[PDB]
Amino acid sequence: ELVNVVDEKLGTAYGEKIDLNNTNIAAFIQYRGLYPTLAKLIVKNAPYESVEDVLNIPGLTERQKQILRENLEHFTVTEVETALVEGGDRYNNGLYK
């Protein structure tokens, strides 16, 4: 009955892809063209019901929609986990080097 919700999340697609609903913003540095501009937009406009939803962010240029479209297979979405998005933690989760 007592489960660590963060360990449980590592067992989902959160553990293998960039979760558009949960992952800290520094993970968007792993793929080109995403950081910082599109990462800022993606985090600010979460949550998303489906990976495809990021293409409906208002303001996207066609080059930015192109960048996202190339990267859709590296994204996922899972239910928002309160412990990962509170505290402003998607912007700074206390991990540096």
């Binding site: 540095i29 080109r32 063209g33 995403l34 950081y35 910082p36 501009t37 599109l38």
Partner: peptide, 13 residues
């Protein structure tokens, strides 16, 4: 080129 005209990581600014 970066040392002459640095940009952000996505090239945008």
């Amino acid at each position: 080129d970066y040392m002459k005209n640095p940009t952000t990581y996505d090239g945008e600014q």
